Amino acid sequence: SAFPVHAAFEKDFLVQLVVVDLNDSMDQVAEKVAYHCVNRRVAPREGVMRVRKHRSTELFPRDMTIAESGLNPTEVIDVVFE
Amino acid sequence: SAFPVHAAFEKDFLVQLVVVDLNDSMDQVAEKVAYHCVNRRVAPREGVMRVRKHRSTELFPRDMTIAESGLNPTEVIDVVFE
Amino acid sequence: FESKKPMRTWSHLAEMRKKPSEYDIVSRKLHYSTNNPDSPWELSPDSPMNLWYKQYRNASPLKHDNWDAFTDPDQLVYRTYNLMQDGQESYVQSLFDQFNEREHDQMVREGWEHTMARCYSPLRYLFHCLQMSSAYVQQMAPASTISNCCILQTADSLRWLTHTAYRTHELSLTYPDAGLGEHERELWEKEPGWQGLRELMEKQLTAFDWGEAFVSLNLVVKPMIVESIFKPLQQQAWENNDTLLPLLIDSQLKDAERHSRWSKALVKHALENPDNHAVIEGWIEKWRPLADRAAEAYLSMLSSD
Amino acid sequence: SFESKKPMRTWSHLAEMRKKPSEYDIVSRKLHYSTNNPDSPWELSPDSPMNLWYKQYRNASPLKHDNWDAFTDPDQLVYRTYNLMQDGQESYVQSLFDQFNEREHDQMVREGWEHTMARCYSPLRYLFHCLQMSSAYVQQMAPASTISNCCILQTADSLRWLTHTAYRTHELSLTYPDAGLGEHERELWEKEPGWQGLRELMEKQLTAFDWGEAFVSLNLVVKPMIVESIFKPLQQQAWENNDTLLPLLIDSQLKDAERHSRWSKALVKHALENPDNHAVIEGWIEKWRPLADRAAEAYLSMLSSD
Amino acid sequence: AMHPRKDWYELTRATNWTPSYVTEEQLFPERMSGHMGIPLEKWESYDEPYKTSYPEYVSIQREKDAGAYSVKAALERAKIYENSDPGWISTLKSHYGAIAVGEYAAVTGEGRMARFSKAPGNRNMATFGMMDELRHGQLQLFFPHEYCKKDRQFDWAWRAYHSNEWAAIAAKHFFDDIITGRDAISVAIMLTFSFETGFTNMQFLGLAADAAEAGDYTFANLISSIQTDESRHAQQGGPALQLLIENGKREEAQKKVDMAIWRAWRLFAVLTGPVMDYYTPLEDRSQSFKEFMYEWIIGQFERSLIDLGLDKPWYWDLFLKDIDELHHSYHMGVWYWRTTAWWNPAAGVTPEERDWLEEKYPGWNKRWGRCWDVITENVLNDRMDLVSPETLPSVCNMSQIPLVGVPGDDWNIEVFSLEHNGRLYHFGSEVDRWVFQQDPVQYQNHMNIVDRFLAGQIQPMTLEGALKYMGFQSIEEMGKDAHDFAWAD
Amino acid sequence: AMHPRKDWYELTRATNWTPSYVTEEQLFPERMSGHMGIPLEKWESYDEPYKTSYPEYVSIQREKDAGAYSVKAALERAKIYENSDPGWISTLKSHYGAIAVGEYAAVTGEGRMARFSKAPGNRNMATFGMMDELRHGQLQLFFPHEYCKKDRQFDWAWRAYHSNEWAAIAAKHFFDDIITGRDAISVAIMLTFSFETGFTNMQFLGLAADAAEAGDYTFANLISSIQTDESRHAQQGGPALQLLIENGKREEAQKKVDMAIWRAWRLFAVLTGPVMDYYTPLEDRSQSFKEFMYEWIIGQFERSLIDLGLDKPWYWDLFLKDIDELHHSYHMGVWYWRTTAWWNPAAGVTPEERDWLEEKYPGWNKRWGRCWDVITENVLNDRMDLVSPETLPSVCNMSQIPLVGVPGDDWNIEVFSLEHNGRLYHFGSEVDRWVFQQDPVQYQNHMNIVDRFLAGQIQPMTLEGALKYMGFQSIEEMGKDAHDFAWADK
Amino acid sequence: STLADQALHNNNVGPIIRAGDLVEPVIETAEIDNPGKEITVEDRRAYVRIAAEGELILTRKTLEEQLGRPFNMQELEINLASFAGQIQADEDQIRFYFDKTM
Amino acid sequence: TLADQALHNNNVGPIIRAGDLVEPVIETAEIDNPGKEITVEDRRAYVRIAAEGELILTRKTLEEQLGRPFNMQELEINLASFAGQIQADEDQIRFYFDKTM
Ligand SMILES: [C]C1=[C][C]=C([O-][O-])[C]=[C]1
Ligand SMILES: [Fe+3]
Numbered sequence A, B: 001s002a003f004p005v006h007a008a009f010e011k012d013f014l015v016q017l018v019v020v021d022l023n024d025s026m027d028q029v030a031e032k033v034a035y036h037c038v039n040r041r042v043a044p045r046e047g048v049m050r051v052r053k054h055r056s057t058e059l060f061p062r063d064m065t066i067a068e069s070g071l072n073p074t075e076v077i078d079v080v081f082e
Numbered sequence C: 001f002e003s004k005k006p007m008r009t010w011s012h013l014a015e016m017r018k019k020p021s022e023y024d025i026v027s028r029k030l031h032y033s034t035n036n037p038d039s040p041w042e043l044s045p046d047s048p049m050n051l052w053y054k055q056y057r058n059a060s061p062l063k064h065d066n067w068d069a070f071t072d073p074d075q076l077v078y079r080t081y082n083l084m085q086d087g088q089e090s091y092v093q094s095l096f097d098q099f100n101e102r103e104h105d106q107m108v109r110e111g112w113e114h115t116m117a118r119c120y121s122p123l124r125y126l127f128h129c130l131q132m133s134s135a136y137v138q139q140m141a142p143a144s145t146i147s148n149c150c151i152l153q154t155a156d157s158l159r160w161l162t163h164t165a166y167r168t169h170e171l172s173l174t175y176p177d178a179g180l181g182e183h184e185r186e187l188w189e190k191e192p193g194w195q196g197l198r199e200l201m202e203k204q205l206t207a208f209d210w211g212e213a214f215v216s217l218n219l220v221v222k223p224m225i226v227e228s229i230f231k232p233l234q235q236q237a238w239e240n241n242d243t244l245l246p247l248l249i250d251s252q253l254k255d256a257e258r259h260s261r262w263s264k265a266l267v268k269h270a271l272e273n274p275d276n277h278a279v280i281e282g283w284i285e286k287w288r289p290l291a292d293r294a295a296e297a298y299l300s301m302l303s304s305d
Numbered sequence D: 001s002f003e004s005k006k007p008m009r010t011w012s013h014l015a016e017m018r019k020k021p022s023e024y025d026i027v028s029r030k031l032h033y034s035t036n037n038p039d040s041p042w043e044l045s046p047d048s049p050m051n052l053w054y055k056q057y058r059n060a061s062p063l064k065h066d067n068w069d070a071f072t073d074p075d076q077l078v079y080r081t082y083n084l085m086q087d088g089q090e091s092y093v094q095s096l097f098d099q100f101n102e103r104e105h106d107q108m109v110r111e112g113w114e115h116t117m118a119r120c121y122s123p124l125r126y127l128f129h130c131l132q133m134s135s136a137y138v139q140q141m142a143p144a145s146t147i148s149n150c151c152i153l154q155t156a157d158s159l160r161w162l163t164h165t166a167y168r169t170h171e172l173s174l175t176y177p178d179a180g181l182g183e184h185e186r187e188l189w190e191k192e193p194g195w196q197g198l199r200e201l202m203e204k205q206l207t208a209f210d211w212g213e214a215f216v217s218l219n220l221v222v223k224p225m226i227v228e229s230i231f232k233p234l235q236q237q238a239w240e241n242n243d244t245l246l247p248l249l250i251d252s253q254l255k256d257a258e259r260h261s262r263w264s265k266a267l268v269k270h271a272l273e274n275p276d277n278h279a280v281i282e283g284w285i286e287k288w289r290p291l292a293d294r295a296a297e298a299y300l301s302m303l304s305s306d
Numbered sequence E: 001a002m003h004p005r006k007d008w009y010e011l012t013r014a015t016n017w018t019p020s021y022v023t024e025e026q027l028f029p030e031r032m033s034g035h036m037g038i039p040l041e042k043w044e045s046y047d048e049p050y051k052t053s054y055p056e057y058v059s060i061q062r063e064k065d066a067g068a069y070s071v072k073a074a075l076e077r078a079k080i081y082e083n084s085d086p087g088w089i090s091t092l093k094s095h096y097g098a099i100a101v102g103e104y105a106a107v108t109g110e111g112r113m114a115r116f117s118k119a120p121g122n123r124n125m126a127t128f129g130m131m132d133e134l135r136h137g138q139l140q141l142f143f144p145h146e147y148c149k150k151d152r153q154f155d156w157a158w159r160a161y162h163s164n165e166w167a168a169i170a171a172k173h174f175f176d177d178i179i180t181g182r183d184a185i186s187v188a189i190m191l192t193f194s195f196e197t198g199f200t201n202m203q204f205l206g207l208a209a210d211a212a213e214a215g216d217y218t219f220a221n222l223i224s225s226i227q228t229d230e231s232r233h234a235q236q237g238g239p240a241l242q243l244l245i246e247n248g249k250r251e252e253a254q255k256k257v258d259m260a261i262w263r264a265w266r267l268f269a270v271l272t273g274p275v276m277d278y279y280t281p282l283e284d285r286s287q288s289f290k291e292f293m294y295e296w297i298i299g300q301f302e303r304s305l306i307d308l309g310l311d312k313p314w315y316w317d318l319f320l321k322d323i324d325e326l327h328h329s330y331h332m333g334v335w336y337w338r339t340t341a342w343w344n345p346a347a348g349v350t351p352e353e354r355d356w357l358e359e360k361y362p363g364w365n366k367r368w369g370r371c372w373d374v375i376t377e378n379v380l381n382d383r384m385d386l387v388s389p390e391t392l393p394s395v396c397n398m399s400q401i402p403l404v405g406v407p408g409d410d411w412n413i414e415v416f417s418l419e420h421n422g423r424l425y426h427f428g429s430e431v432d433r434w435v436f437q438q439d440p441v442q443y444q445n446h447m448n449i450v451d452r453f454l455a456g457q458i459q460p461m462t463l464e465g466a467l468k469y470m471g472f473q474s475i476e477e478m479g480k481d482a483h484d485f486a487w488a489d
Numbered sequence F: 001a002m003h004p005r006k007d008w009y010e011l012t013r014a015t016n017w018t019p020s021y022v023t024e025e026q027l028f029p030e031r032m033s034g035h036m037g038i039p040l041e042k043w044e045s046y047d048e049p050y051k052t053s054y055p056e057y058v059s060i061q062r063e064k065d066a067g068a069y070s071v072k073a074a075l076e077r078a079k080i081y082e083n084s085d086p087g088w089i090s091t092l093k094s095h096y097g098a099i100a101v102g103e104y105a106a107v108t109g110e111g112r113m114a115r116f117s118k119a120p121g122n123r124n125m126a127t128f129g130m131m132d133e134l135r136h137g138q139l140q141l142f143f144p145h146e147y148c149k150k151d152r153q154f155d156w157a158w159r160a161y162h163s164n165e166w167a168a169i170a171a172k173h174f175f176d177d178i179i180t181g182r183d184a185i186s187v188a189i190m191l192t193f194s195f196e197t198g199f200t201n202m203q204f205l206g207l208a209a210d211a212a213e214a215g216d217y218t219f220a221n222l223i224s225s226i227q228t229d230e231s232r233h234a235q236q237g238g239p240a241l242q243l244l245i246e247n248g249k250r251e252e253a254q255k256k257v258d259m260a261i262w263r264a265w266r267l268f269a270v271l272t273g274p275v276m277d278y279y280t281p282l283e284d285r286s287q288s289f290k291e292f293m294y295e296w297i298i299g300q301f302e303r304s305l306i307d308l309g310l311d312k313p314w315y316w317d318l319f320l321k322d323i324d325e326l327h328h329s330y331h332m333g334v335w336y337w338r339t340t341a342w343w344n345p346a347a348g349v350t351p352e353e354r355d356w357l358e359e360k361y362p363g364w365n366k367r368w369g370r371c372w373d374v375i376t377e378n379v380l381n382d383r384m385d386l387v388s389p390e391t392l393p394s395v396c397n398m399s400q401i402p403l404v405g406v407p408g409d410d411w412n413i414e415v416f417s418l419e420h421n422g423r424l425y426h427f428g429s430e431v432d433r434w435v436f437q438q439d440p441v442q443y444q445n446h447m448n449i450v451d452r453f454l455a456g457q458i459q460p461m462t463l464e465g466a467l468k469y470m471g472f473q474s475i476e477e478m479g480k481d482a483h484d485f486a487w488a489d490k
Numbered sequence G: 001s002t003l004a005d006q007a008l009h010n011n012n013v014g015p016i017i018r019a020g021d022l023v024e025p026v027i028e029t030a031e032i033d034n035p036g037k038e039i040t041v042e043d044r045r046a047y048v049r050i051a052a053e054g055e056l057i058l059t060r061k062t063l064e065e066q067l068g069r070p071f072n073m074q075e076l077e078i079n080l081a082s083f084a085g086q087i088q089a090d091e092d093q094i095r096f097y098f099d100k101t102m
Numbered sequence H: 001t002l003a004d005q006a007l008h009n010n011n012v013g014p015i016i017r018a019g020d021l022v023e024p025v026i027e028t029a030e031i032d033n034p035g036k037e038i039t040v041e042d043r044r045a046y047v048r049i050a051a052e053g054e055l056i057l058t059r060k061t062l063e064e065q066l067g068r069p070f071n072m073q074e075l076e077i078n079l080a081s082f083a084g085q086i087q088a089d090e091d092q093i094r095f096y097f098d099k100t101m
């Protein structure tokens, strides 16, 4: 089911509403955010996109789902590269 | 022996004050008028310059002097080509 | 979305059958605070000022489906108000100048300076109450065309206050031993002849429903001031060889008649809702006794020797 | 060879001022070019009719000064500030007319006052138009633009007074339609004994064509007489007859009249820098005073009857 | 309440009376009044069609000036002086110098009527006329005064009428003839009707259109506001004309109109003609000089003259031919003698301008173009001594403007001369000589500037001496080519 | 003769009296008056330093309008609409929409003081303030009205405050907080001191300088005439501040100033910032946005604050950093989301403009330039779908403007979040979160436009449905690139 | 000229309004107050020449309605820079007209 | 430190909008504050005029430099802003600071 987040993508200028799914993996979450940023205001690049709570030092595992993460709807996440 | 006339030169746009001499010939009068007209607003050309009373049918002879012509000071003359 | 041509005027005016006037363009439908009943102001719906407006404007028993349709019968805007009033006020100031040159105040009947000190100079308190009250109706009224009439009326009230200040000081130059400019606050607070008016105004200034505020101020208080203060002062000045005060009051009465004009236009608009006749009548009858007592006390004081 | 010069901050003729030139200086000073050439005031034949007129009646005047152009209006008025001042005063008078009419003031004057108005007040439009015509003559003959400008505004003021009188004559006739108001003023001006002193004065004054004698007769003799012997007695008479509008109206006209006297006295003061001018002015004042005195006594005899 | 103007207006002009202590002719002398023997009573039928009265006059004029000054104040930093084409700046210098003190002189024309007209309505309207021209002279001194500190040529806004510069003499000879030098009725006919409903529209509205295109709104707004006054007090002329016709003086009225129109024409051909067709940048020319003439003088003014009962002037066909030809020669002369002007003439003969001149005046390039060809080649070849004159032009004894004709392929020039009282006069047209003959006493002893030069009144008797006689106080004040001959590149 | 104002002025403000038939607190209730318990008698020392009185007010204001309207009339044919750069026209549309009906709302802030302030001089000057703001609202409706027939976006001069368009919500949230939603003393401090001696100078005089460079004298003359009224009635705030300081309320006065300045800053960063550095044609930029801020806010306003006895705000260095960065991101967002604006934003990133930006903001090309590079290439490749958004930005719960940061080579973005009363809020700065915490009852149940989007209030729940919710009535009204992307060819 | 004869033989009357706030209201008034007359308008930016054949009326009532603010006829001269035709003006209207027909 | 230096100023004086008062106010500031340096920044739509600590404009000088009758109250037609606190009366306006920074 629908799960709204506010996402900040690495090297973009803003935070955006992105609706993901409760059982999306973090990899799927990053791609849903990237849709609204890469090749729009952010240059594409090589590397693995990772998801974290905003400003956090820890990254969510790539295969962890939104349900498994403990995130709440409307919390803020970053999408950053290794 | 200054003698003022008002002279209109052929193809010029105006009448001008020109001071000639009582004993100038008409050829010499024509040259003094031309000084103020030819190569100023009037193109040079082949031909003999003649003097006449303003818009008269008759030309003064080339060697006749101002004194001999019966012209009075400040009368209008034309300088034209035959 | 569809494609549409430009309009000759504002979208809300483009349905008009005539070309909109300067008044229409700059005056109509400017209170955005009436659009959202639950949040007049763009804040928390339960913010203090949102609660104030929901109680004292939205929940007023004086109701109309289209307050914005109200029209100033004089169609005044800021520009034309100042043109009209610069003409009237330069006339009043020219009267002041010439009557002073003539030493008019010297020639009033003996004792008139004491009547002025007691019955005229404290009017600056009454006029300031009208000014404060008009500003309150301005900020609460549910249509910008209503509020604009109240803005100009607030300014007119200050105009009258200022006339009184100027003349109070001027009179004291000829009559320096009458308390002019010195005792007006004490008279307003303590003299019996002012106590009906002051009780009326302290109560009127604490009537916070916009509709009751309008009715009490413009349909009860201000007409009483015309009939029971302005015109009797003119008669008494006549009897005491004060020929300036009648002309000054005539200028002020032209403002007061203008206030009555737009007020009655608003009543006529409001009465389109048949429920509003009983509301207005109840408020008039609620406030009339206080107004009548105010007048009778003032008049007993004015006719005092 | 031509000298070199850099731009000046103002007109060449004002550039030697100590002070910074005022709006008045800029737009008012040294504008009569007709005084530059004594033999040809106007750029025509030196003996054209108007050149002969100006050489006789301006250049040859016994009132003389080397620098008439230095005269200064003490009120320093220009067209722009005249209209600002008079729009204020005239809108005040028109507001008085409006309000006193609302009060039906004219109904409450003392019985018979309408006949005194019809005889002694409404024919003033003829007197004031003579002042208008006369002021315009001093305008066109005076030897400096700053003098002529004072005369222009004085011409307009005379028409202002004329128009007041026209308006109030008509207005009074609405309350008193059987007094001749607006009907008989020419006949009174021409035949009534109390007007004949003023009419003879003005007909002769209007044929004094010397610019100096015109100024002195008009502004130092005729117009002060009207203040002392017409304006102020009318105010006193209105007070005795419960006319409260006329004293206020005349008070406004008197502000104009005092302004006319102010610039007149300033011109006298400027003229008297030439010591010869004192006898010239006094001689004209003495010449015209008997006519003006007779004019006042005849008018005042008429006013004080009933 | 207030009573409306219609109910008391007649009393404001019930001011005629029968003099008893002087005669009617003493009070209204013919030389100053010009009543032509028409009795006092006949003049009371004069009815001015454009009325005003003192309260509304001062109120409305206060508003007119408030707008004119506030527009000037708000545009001081619009960089008109620094950014405008130099030809546009010259147009401003020309306008203010030729007009400002002549407006002040018009006060006297109006004052002449205010005192000496037998028509009471005329005397009142002329009083407002006096006030109007005071406004116009003061406005047109005040507005250029700020540019004194930029350019000495702007001093001529004040100085021109105090000088003997030839164009100033032409202006003063015209304005002293029609404004300040004749009786009140002649002023009514020649100034208010002929000049003020006829030709001023060219300089104050035609030029305003060009000013608007050039982006100079201070100036366009000023002169169009001035013309709103003109439109009112110029309506004094019509009623006077009607009265003269009704009382058997149609012939004399016609003569005064015919004269004043021709005199005004020659002056505006030298002032406005060069401005409209040469100084104004090509892209700012709303219409040509001739097109504006056909709008304002032929289509508007001459039609109004017919409607009032007068005839086309006898010189109609000469006038029409003059509109095609005269100002092109006046322009050429002002430019060639530019050092005698207080403004900087633009030559206005770039190839793009010469194309426009050919379209608006077919045949231009085979006529004036022949002279500009010679001048242009000299400029390119750096023969600058041949683009500055070394003698004086011959000058008309009426208009005070030099004697010109059509140059080039079909050269034609004619001077109309006259021996009178032992003196030889020369005129630039049949009509100018006719004007002289209508009133010789007005003109016969006047000497034009070249008459003075030849009679010893200009010392030294040289072109530099003449320039000093004309009042130039420094080398910077004399006119130069507006674009420094850039047009030849 | 006439007597001079100094001799009768005191009587015009001798209007306080001791109530007897109601209590003092009934007549001046704290929730509307804000007297902070300071008794009536103390307010009588209030002395407005910029005085006027009724006769001179109507006389001088007649003269001011006569000039403003005469200039407009004389320049109607100057071809400003036809010939101006399209970015200048967008500046006009933005100004009139964001300003006109808010000026009319300021009548109510002044009216709040005229009725409810305990200081008699305040009540009188606020009556003239009511009149002034009436003037400003009517002027700024009358002037753009003639362009309704040219362009439907000018309808927003009247319509914006009646809409839920995101920038109008941001404007209304600010003005309802500082002008119409608080007691009279808060209005004196927040509106007349902080906003009207601080920030309005940027939009009514800084922008006038640019307007004069661009040759739009009708507009420059209008807004500078407006600011002469501002300069008079804004002087109601200083004496109020001094009185609070004298009566032991310094801390409370400082807090209201700190809050109002920050709230005004975020709004002017999104309105004025893009105008001065991007919409205004390069050759007409008299100074950069930051240079104007240092003239008007740092050099003038903050110095005046010190002189009255208050301190630099606690957030001083954060504010200075914001001046270097915030409006560049606000501009990018307004541009990328241009279809949600009622004006046509200019991108402002031609090569010569990017040189000027780099000179005025060293490092700009390595930050915001990185985003503009991606945008520029997509335009060149005709991938216009990648230059328009398919989601909504996340929005600050205080300023109502989206959450932004620094993009590109040294990317940094920070949201300041807050749990409060069972709700999670997000703020664009640490000061914005502090403002909420100062008065949560003012704000706590407000929902920003994305809160409403997520709660089902905007149907359809898409960008197109949000545009409908924002009140656009035709395709023409929604913003597009000011130059139809011609800047990309350069 | 035939061109000159044609230019002279016109019956065009009407106001010349200088640039400002009266241009559009006067054009609209000329149209409304002279129905069944063709109004011609020549725009010269600094002024507009408005005309009809034989007579053209501007009424005070219509002028006020098209201008949008109180207006009296005497005020017209703030903006009436010239006119074609003779003039009959009173408190209710102004009429531009010719006596003759060419 | 650029912000420090902008804040630590003592500049006071009028900001005059474009119009007929700009040059007379500059001239009056010079005349009525001798031995003060007057600074002028021209932004075309307005001019920022300042002196250190105190700047006085008297009505008499203003009237002489403007060239027409003038009352102090009329200055607000053209006084678009100002630096310093203001003390204004019928004879002058004075811009001033209580503190020195
Ligand atoms: C120069 C001149 C004169 C006259 C007229 O009007 O008046 C115009 C111009
Ligand atoms: Fe004129």
Ligand SMILES: [Fe+3]
Binding pocket: E106, E133, E196, E230, E233
């Ligand atoms: Fe004229």
Ligand SMILES: [Fe+3]
Binding pocket: F103, F106, F132, F133, F136, F226, F230
């Ligand atoms: Fe405002």
Ligand SMILES: [Fe+3]
Binding pocket: F106, F133, F196, F230, F233
């Ligand atoms: Fe404000």
